[PDB]
Amino acid sequence: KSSCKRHPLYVDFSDVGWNDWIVAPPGYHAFYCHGECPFPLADHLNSTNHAIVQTLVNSVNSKIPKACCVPTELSAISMLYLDENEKVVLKNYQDMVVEGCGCR
């Protein structure tokens, strides 16, 4: 089974219905994190002490789930929406793009 790494994901706002409020852009590359968090985890700069302990505990007791593969580095994006009396508004939305993954 594949390890924790970033995967591509382009979000088309029309496909999720957010085209009803987002003027620009039509979509964007969000990415996503997926994959297993196995022994050892330290090879990941991003893997918290808990993520290590949980994974170690999991190797002794299977009933305790492994650490999870999630974004640990994110970037922001600018988006355009409409104001009252249909004026354009620019807003920066944070944690929109996965720059990196890690076990947590």
Binding site: V16, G17, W18, D20, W21, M79, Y81, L82, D83, E84, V89, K91, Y93
Partner: protein, 64 residues
């Protein structure tokens, strides 16, 4: 200044909880909460996720 934080936590009490058990009256009231803070949430991501989410539970549970 966008009141979905209030509205989302108030519905996350009624449903769940404790389909239709008995309503839909939790979905009717949450939709109104959004519908009111509508003007203060034009550029809010969760607000639009909320409004888009409510719609999906409305058609599945067949209320109205």
């Amino acid at each position: 200044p966008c009141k979905i934080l209030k509205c989302n936590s108030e519905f996350w009490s009624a449903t769940s909880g404790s389909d239709t058990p008995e309503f839909c009256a939790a979905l009717r009231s949450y939709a109104l909460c959004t519908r009111r803070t509508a003007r203060t949430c034009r550029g809010d991501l969760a607000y639009h996720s909320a409004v888009h989410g409510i719609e999906d539970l409305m058609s599945q549970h067949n209320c109205s």
